[PDB]
Amino acid sequence: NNPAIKRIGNHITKSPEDKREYRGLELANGIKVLLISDPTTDKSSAALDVHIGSLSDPPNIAGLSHFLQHMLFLGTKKYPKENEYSQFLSEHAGSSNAFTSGEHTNYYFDVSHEHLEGALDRFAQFFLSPLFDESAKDREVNAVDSEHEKNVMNDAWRLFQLEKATGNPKHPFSKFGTGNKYTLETRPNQEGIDVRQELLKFHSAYYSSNLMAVVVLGRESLDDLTNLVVKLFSEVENKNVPLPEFPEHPFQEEHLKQLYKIVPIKDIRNLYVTFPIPDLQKYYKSNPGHYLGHLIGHEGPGSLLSELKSKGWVNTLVGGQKEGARGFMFFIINVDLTEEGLLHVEDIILHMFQYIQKLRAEGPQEWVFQELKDLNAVAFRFKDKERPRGYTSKIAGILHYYPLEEVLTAEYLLEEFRPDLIEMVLDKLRPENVRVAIVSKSFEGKTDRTEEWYGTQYKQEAIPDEVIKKWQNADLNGKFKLPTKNEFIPTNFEILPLEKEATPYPALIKDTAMSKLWFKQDDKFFLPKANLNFEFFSPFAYVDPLHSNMAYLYLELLKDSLNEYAYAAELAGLSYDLQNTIYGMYLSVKGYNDKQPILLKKIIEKMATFEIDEKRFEIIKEAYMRSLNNFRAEQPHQHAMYYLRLLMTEVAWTKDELKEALDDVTLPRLKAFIPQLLSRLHIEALLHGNITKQAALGIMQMVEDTLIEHAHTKPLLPSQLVRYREVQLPDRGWFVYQQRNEVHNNSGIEIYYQTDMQSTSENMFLELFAQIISEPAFNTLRTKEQLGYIVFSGPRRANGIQGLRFIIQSEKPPHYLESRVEAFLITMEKSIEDMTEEAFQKHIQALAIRRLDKPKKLSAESAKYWGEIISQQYNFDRDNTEVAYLKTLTKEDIIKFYKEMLAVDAPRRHKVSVHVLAREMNLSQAPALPQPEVIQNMTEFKRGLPLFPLVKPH
Ligand SMILES: [Zn+2]
């Protein structure tokens, strides 16, 4: 035997398509482990999930377990340097993150495959001897505060906390999870609490081996991973902590039959219907809640949504089970509301109960369960191979819920038909346990309560007993019918033999006035799936704001019109994406290849013969007005990015321009625009997956023929295939553009140091520099100086040009943010001077692994080719070519590049800053800056600068 292993599990059931090898075990201290050997992986990975979270915070220190989560990265006894962990990962092509929910704290990393043991050693110390350094703790509490600030004016986070504030206030469910500076520092100081001791006591008490699950994925054999994991994790102490459990529901009698009226930040209108239910987790082999969700949440003919949509009351619906914690769950039905829907909330909820009554009338349906079982089995068999980092993290969470042997299958395979469970859940969906929440600006100034942590304005009322009664007597409405058999369920999974003429990259197999067709038969994944991507080029999609509006509205009305039919295809693993672009339209069809030509045909046919329903048109136009308006409530950093895009691209219509133009979109006008849009087009496509050349040629010509037949499409002239250019900033110039975010009380900044056109050498100069400064920028600007939670640095690529950008969101003013980025850039010039040759070669090597990391699934490989196609660079072998050149670079080359393009006194510095002010508006030495040119009018700024050329094709 082995003293350190309690048991090794039996065979871990996996998909027969899965070439990874697996071994489950439990250590003697109680840690549940999954080991995954993949000898092909470029990045290895591990995750650890401790089954404690938020719901176990001390009642007097809200946010503690989330604070501990941040603090664990900031040093341990064996590795006391504050960023030893992140720096180690950065220098070895790795990355890490963590999250805290009510019951789990989950930590994960990935790393270059040769450096697993080093990464994993440093990571294991988190669970053995964190330092919770006093100085780290006082700085890091600012990152958490700033994380909560970002969430404060977000509607989803406000609704999430509001639900917890209106159940039983004594129940742990009512806790505030994120915490902030108030809860984590200010108030504890006032109460004589030593937060460092609290972190140490909480870690001591709950970070117990018996509550942990570990997953490790590496090239090493299963035996080697076994020894590694025993070596590192055997020392975690078992304190035998009982798993926390919450058998009493946070919504008791007095919390039921309540109506909440809520003021949102965005102009949104929604209706939330909720019923408390028991915890159904233990019934995973039948999944009664999924069965009900699938039915109540259906979007096919005869569905609930379908009738609410025809009445013109709602556009969208989500229904089904929602997680609570060990011992309680919820079942939801939530919809968005049209203006007319807002006035018929009562009738909407009755239709919900009529639909529920139809399910009780028909009884549990074994054929529905069989369909669900069959799709889940196909989905599991042909699951795309996952990136290691998300895969270890996700399995760590679920090791707490399923036997070792079933961890891979348990969320997929259904085994038991349980009409008794289906009826038992359905018996809880009754008007006597209903909670109803309406979100709308119409409640402004009509509310009388305020939620503490977010400020949310709402009113609570009992639902009148006569309203409950009307709902309890709901009868059968003849518009509601069970869905019928889903005929998109695929049954042909044959993998076509690899053709003799198959190539490693996409090949241009059709090059005509109408269409350019890039094609590759999958030679790696061997799943019965394909991706079909199309750019439709037309100047009329973006010629003015009005047209761009009409392009959008057309495509939204089209998707709305197809929804009923397309929903079945997407339950059957066949989906599509359709949107207007600054060039035209983009269409992508992905998933099982079997029925895929059927759905594609249908989209092109509808596209080309579309008849707008006038009612759908007014509803979708009003949602779009709101959606443009609601931009004002996005975050300051999203504003800054959005303004830079408008500043640097040749053509770009603002949200304001689109909004003004929107009133002039009439039905007549939209009906005229469509044939005009479709009259002349160019189509560039990538057809990639389980498909032959001649099926690819056939699919392409079928799209052409359908357009030609129905919309009389002719080819665009080559000269009209315009790409837009980037604005060319002058040597030594600095421009600032300044605006205010009217909603958030944080500011945001984007700083862009433009370099030159993209090419091999320029790319790798910028990428290597970015790789070098990446971790230090986060360490400096966030961990040390604490300027904000959101601190970002990296390449910016647009319209064939590039440069270095910095994005920060902070309470500090933008001019101060600027000076800190500038101090930091100097700090980096010195680090680069002082770093060893070997330190320098480790960064080359890390960038190299990053760039050469193999796609693990079809759609990631398609996305690489697609980026070559849409950028018109067509450099399909870029990665080998760029990396060969990268390996040639020296320290001097990067110092010279920095001195020429980036330094404060650089001869070719080209800087633009976007300053977004907050609603209401020791340290290294910042250099003196010149006086900037303040941009007053974006159109004038553009007209007075040159425009770069466009990049040439391979
Ligand atoms: Zn956090």
Side-chain angles (χ1 to χ4, degrees):
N1 99 155
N2 194 313
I5 314 300
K6 198 180 322 184
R7 68 192 162 94
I8 301 183
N10 299 127
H11 176 257
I12 311 288
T13 303
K14 58 170 185 175
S15 160
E17 311 289 330
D18 190 351
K19 287 158 211 71
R20 294 159 304 188
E21 301 288 320
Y22 296 87
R23 179 178 291 168
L25 56 196
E26 196 177 348
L27 304 186
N29 63 8
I31 297 191
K32 292 150 254 38
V33 176
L34 214 237
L35 302 170
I36 310 170
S37 187
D38 190 348
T40 79
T41 190
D42 296 303
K43 284 193 201 160
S44 303
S45 180
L48 191 151
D49 183 289
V50 188
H51 212 334
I52 281 93
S54 274
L55 260 10
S56 302
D57 292 341
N60 59 333
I61 322 191
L64 187 65
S65 85
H66 169 226
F67 197 37
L68 185 146
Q69 186 246 96
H70 285 241
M71 291 302 296
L72 297 193
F73 293 76
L74 303 181
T76 63
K77 226 261 259 236
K78 311 264 82 70
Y79 292 105
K81 189 154 85 229
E82 184 165 278
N83 65 340
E84 166 63 34
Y85 171 81
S86 63
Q87 176 194 81
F88 182 83
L89 291 180
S90 190
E91 292 181 353
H92 296 91
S95 65
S96 197
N97 219 327
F99 65 78
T100 306
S101 62
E103 301 176 291
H104 291 275
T105 313
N106 184 300
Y107 303 81
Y108 46 94
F109 72 83
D110 62 17
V111 68
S112 143
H113 81 269
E114 292 233 294
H115 294 282
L116 209 208
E117 162 149 24
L120 189 64
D121 194 41
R122 292 160 173 78
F123 174 82
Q125 304 315 307
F126 292 22
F127 309 100
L128 293 164
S129 330
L131 287 179
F132 303 122
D133 179 84
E134 195 69 38
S135 155
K137 147 175 99 34
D138 301 323
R139 277 172 286 115
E140 190 60 11
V141 71
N142 292 289
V144 166
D145 191 63
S146 177
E147 178 173 359
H148 171 68
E149 275 304 305
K150 148 181 74 72
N151 301 334
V152 151
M153 298 284 126
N154 182 272
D155 292 302
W157 283 96
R158 290 164 73 85
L159 267 16
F160 168 86
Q161 195 71 33
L162 178 58
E163 177 168 61
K164 297 169 169 278
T166 64
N168 172 9
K170 309 187 192 169
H171 193 289
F173 183 72
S174 63
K175 290 160 156 173
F176 175 40
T178 307
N180 62 20
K181 179 147 161 177
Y182 187 68
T183 70
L184 263 358
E185 172 181 286
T186 308
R187 169 125 87 180
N189 284 160
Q190 285 165 190
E191 299 184 352
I193 301 177
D194 185 352
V195 183
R196 182 171 186 256
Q197 291 295 320
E198 298 314 318
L199 291 160
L200 285 165
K201 299 211 284 215
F202 192 104
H203 190 268
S204 198
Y206 298 108
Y207 277 58
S208 183
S209 67
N210 72 297
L211 293 190
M212 306 174 165
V214 184
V215 181
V216 180
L217 185 160
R219 287 197 177 186
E220 286 78 0
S221 74
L222 293 168
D223 295 332
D224 289 342
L225 294 167
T226 302
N227 299 332
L228 219 200
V229 164
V230 161
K231 196 202 267 87
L232 297 174
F233 289 92
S234 275
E235 345 161 21
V236 178
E237 277 200 63
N238 198 355
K239 294 213 191 63
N240 317 281
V241 183
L243 214 213
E245 316 219 89
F246 313 84
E248 205 192 302
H249 211 291
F251 303 155
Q252 291 297 303
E253 264 175 50
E254 68 278 20
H255 314 104
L256 311 171
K257 312 183 274 143
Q258 300 297 304
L259 167 63
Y260 303 84
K261 281 156 187 189
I262 302 160
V263 179
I265 303 307
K266 288 187 173 182
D267 186 4
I268 53 179
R269 282 177 227 116
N270 301 115
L271 158 61
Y272 295 93
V273 178
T274 146
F275 310 85
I277 53 164
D279 191 355
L280 308 173
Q281 166 60 30
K282 63 191 163 206
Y283 305 125
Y284 70 95
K285 292 182 193 175
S286 43
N287 226 318
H290 165 51
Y291 173 103
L292 290 168
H294 164 77
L295 267 6
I296 302 218
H298 217 269
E299 307 189 3
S303 67
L304 181 52
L305 199 224
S306 194
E307 184 61 7
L308 298 171
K309 190 140 166 185
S310 283
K311 293 277 210 172
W313 295 338
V314 329
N315 311 296
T316 65
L317 181 157
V318 32
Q321 70 167 51
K322 172 174 101 162
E323 286 179 71
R326 301 275 181 175
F328 66 97
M329 275 189 58
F330 309 88
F331 190 99
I332 54 93
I333 314 185
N334 303 331
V335 295
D336 76 335
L337 293 169
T338 64
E339 308 186 85
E340 190 67 30
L342 176 69
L343 306 171
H344 287 269
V345 165
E346 198 182 317
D347 289 329
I348 289 166
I349 313 301
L350 172 73
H351 284 61
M352 294 175 179
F353 284 113
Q354 294 175 336
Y355 192 90
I356 288 160
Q357 190 60 41
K358 177 61 166 169
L359 302 180
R360 304 194 235 263
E362 302 285 305
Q365 299 293 308
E366 194 169 340
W367 79 271
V368 174
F369 173 85
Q370 253 256 82
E371 269 201 6
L372 261 19
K373 167 166 170 263
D374 286 350
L375 266 358
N376 278 4
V378 166
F380 174 74
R381 183 167 158 34
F382 304 110
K383 194 166 28 79
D384 281 340
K385 183 167 177 198
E386 300 88 343
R387 285 163 295 147
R389 198 182 126 235
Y391 201 45
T392 58
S393 181
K394 161 89 182 145
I395 303 332
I398 59 108
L399 279 170
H400 295 300
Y401 296 91
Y402 307 110
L404 251 26
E405 294 83 8
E406 298 169 33
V407 261
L408 303 186
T409 62
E411 294 207 320
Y412 282 94
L413 307 176
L414 290 180
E415 273 173 48
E416 279 172 27
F417 183 50
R418 289 280 242 116
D420 59 311
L421 300 175
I422 296 171
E423 178 198 315
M424 176 259 95
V425 181
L426 218 33
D427 192 45
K428 300 275 189 327
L429 312 181
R430 290 186 190 281
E432 69 278 16
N433 41 301
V434 78
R435 293 169 42 93
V436 170
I438 321 293
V439 178
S440 173
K441 291 284 213 205
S442 65
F443 302 127
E444 173 108 49
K446 297 180 211 320
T447 68
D448 56 15
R449 292 180 166 87
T450 295
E451 192 284 312
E452 176 162 13
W453 299 115
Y454 287 77
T456 319
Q457 305 185 125
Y458 73 106
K459 195 196 187 327
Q460 178 186 348
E461 293 163 18
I463 318 240
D465 266 294
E466 65 271 7
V467 173
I468 308 293
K469 275 32 166 204
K470 231 250 315 187
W471 294 337
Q472 293 172 329
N473 299 130
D475 220 286
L476 299 177
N477 176 335
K479 295 281 174 157
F480 301 141
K481 279 143 171 189
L482 271 39
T484 58
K485 195 90 228 323
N486 180 354
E487 329 257 54
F488 279 102
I489 291 170
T491 60
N492 177 17
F493 297 120
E494 182 184 342
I495 308 296
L496 293 148
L498 220 59
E499 295 180 291
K500 273 165 230 118
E501 274 177 1
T503 51
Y505 299 125
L508 186 48
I509 61 165
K510 179 192 200 176
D511 186 10
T512 66
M514 191 83 150
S515 75
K516 230 196 255 71
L517 173 41
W518 296 95
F519 159 78
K520 187 196 161 173
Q521 200 178 4
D522 171 33
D523 66 345
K524 269 159 193 95
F525 306 109
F526 305 108
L527 301 178
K529 291 180 197 176
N531 303 326
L532 317 179
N533 294 192
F534 303 93
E535 268 273 336
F536 295 86
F537 289 96
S538 175
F540 287 83
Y542 210 63
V543 58
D544 60 10
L546 183 71
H547 285 253
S548 165
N549 286 335
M550 289 197 295
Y552 176 88
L553 261 359
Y554 167 47
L555 263 16
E556 287 298 309
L557 284 154
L558 193 51
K559 295 186 264 182
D560 182 71
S561 167
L562 280 169
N563 188 68
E564 267 211 4
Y565 167 98
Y567 187 72
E570 103 132 333
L571 296 176
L574 214 209
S575 68
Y576 83 99
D577 194 12
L578 176 70
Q579 55 212 206
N580 66 300
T581 66
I582 65 195
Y583 293 116
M585 300 176 281
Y586 161 71
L587 201 213
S588 185
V589 182
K590 290 194 219 293
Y592 301 109
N593 66 272
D594 187 7
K595 301 288 164 85
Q596 186 167 70
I598 304 306
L599 168 72
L600 208 211
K601 219 286 135 149
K602 196 73 163 34
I603 293 157
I604 311 295
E605 196 180 75
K606 252 256 163 81
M607 199 150 309
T609 60
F610 192 45
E611 303 187 70
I612 301 101
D613 168 6
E614 182 162 1
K615 267 324 293 290
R616 293 266 86 219
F617 166 76
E618 298 286 13
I619 281 156
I620 285 152
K621 175 183 192 220
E622 189 279 345
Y624 178 49
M625 190 49 104
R626 291 186 299 108
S627 167
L628 296 164
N629 264 321
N630 289 333
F631 196 65
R632 64 154 171 79
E634 291 298 29
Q635 245 145 59
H637 81 285
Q638 307 167 301
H639 282 192
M641 291 167 90
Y642 158 81
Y643 299 126
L644 184 72
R645 227 134 56 205
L646 300 177
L647 285 161
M648 293 304 100
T649 334
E650 189 183 352
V651 178
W653 308 121
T654 77
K655 251 88 177 147
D656 282 4
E657 294 174 322
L658 299 170
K659 205 198 291 153
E660 291 186 44
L662 190 51
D663 286 330
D664 308 298
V665 171
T666 57
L667 197 46
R669 217 107 58 119
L670 221 209
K671 283 170 162 177
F673 156 89
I674 302 166
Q676 166 66 235
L677 189 62
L678 300 180
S679 56
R680 328 211 63 165
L681 298 156
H682 181 71
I683 300 158
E684 187 159 12
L686 205 210
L687 300 193
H688 175 31
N690 183 37
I691 36 173
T692 60
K693 175 177 173 147
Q694 68 252 35
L697 286 162
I699 285 161
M700 191 66 254
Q701 194 62 51
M702 165 194 320
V703 167
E704 296 182 42
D705 289 3
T706 305
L707 288 158
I708 290 163
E709 183 189 337
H710 292 282
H712 305 289
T713 308
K714 304 168 68 160
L716 227 38
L717 265 340
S719 66
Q720 294 174 281
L721 303 169
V722 299
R723 246 47 192 249
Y724 301 116
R725 295 153 177 259
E726 175 150 311
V727 173
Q728 164 160 196
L729 266 11
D731 299 351
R732 313 187 108 106
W734 180 23
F735 304 78
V736 167
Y737 179 71
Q738 196 190 246
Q739 278 291 323
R740 200 168 59 97
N741 186 294
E742 75 163 75
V743 168
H744 295 255
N745 198 23
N746 267 204
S747 65
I749 206 263
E750 185 165 358
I751 300 179
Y752 177 42
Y753 298 99
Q754 178 184 69
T755 60
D756 210 332
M757 288 213 2
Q758 297 162 40
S759 63
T760 296
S761 64
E762 287 297 312
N763 291 175
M764 291 329 272
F765 276 97
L766 173 71
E767 293 181 16
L768 210 213
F769 190 77
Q771 153 66 39
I772 290 175
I773 69 163
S774 181
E775 185 279 327
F778 179 90
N779 184 238
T780 301
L781 274 3
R782 169 162 147 183
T783 314
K784 289 171 172 175
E785 304 185 25
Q786 294 293 150
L787 300 171
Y789 178 82
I790 301 294
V791 168
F792 179 89
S793 80
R796 181 183 131 113
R797 277 49 187 283
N799 299 310
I801 293 67
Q802 60 196 334
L804 208 213
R805 60 162 167 189
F806 286 86
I807 297 161
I808 297 130
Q809 176 164 299
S810 173
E811 73 185 298
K812 288 258 66 203
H815 66 269
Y816 178 84
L817 270 14
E818 289 263 21
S819 77
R820 296 280 104 210
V821 176
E822 299 280 355
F824 167 77
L825 257 359
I826 304 281
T827 294
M828 281 320 301
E829 165 183 18
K830 307 159 176 158
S831 304
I832 290 175
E833 292 186 325
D834 302 335
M835 70 173 34
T836 64
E837 212 67 42
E838 196 37 59
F840 180 82
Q841 297 292 142
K842 255 174 219 218
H843 286 291
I844 274 165
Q845 174 65 11
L847 211 206
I849 298 302
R850 286 178 151 114
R851 283 307 296 285
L852 290 182
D853 192 17
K854 294 176 317 263
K856 327 275 185 326
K857 62 181 181 181
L858 184 67
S859 76
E861 194 195 355
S862 303
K864 292 173 65 79
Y865 302 149
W866 193 239
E868 300 300 329
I869 306 297
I870 54 122
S871 67
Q872 313 207 257
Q873 298 188 20
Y874 306 109
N875 190 352
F876 298 129
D877 198 37
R878 182 188 301 283
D879 294 332
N880 298 122
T881 278
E882 283 183 358
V883 160
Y885 178 85
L886 190 234
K887 278 183 179 171
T888 259
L889 262 24
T890 58
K891 257 169 65 163
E892 287 279 306
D893 291 325
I894 301 295
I895 289 152
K896 282 173 174 182
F897 167 77
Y898 162 91
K899 277 176 161 58
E900 209 194 349
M901 319 292 309
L902 300 182
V904 70
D905 57 0
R908 314 219 270 125
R909 190 171 240 220
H910 315 115
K911 187 189 183 184
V912 176
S913 303
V914 176
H915 290 10
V916 182
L917 309 175
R919 208 208 299 140
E920 307 299 342
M921 263 168 206
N922 43 314
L923 293 181
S924 78
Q925 167 83 316
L929 306 178
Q931 196 93 356
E933 193 176 307
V934 184
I935 286 98
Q936 226 96 238
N937 181 293
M938 298 201 294
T939 309
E940 276 169 18
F941 166 80
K942 270 131 79 154
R943 285 181 43 251
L945 287 181
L947 287 183
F948 269 100
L950 278 340
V951 162
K952 291 160 205 310
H954 240 247

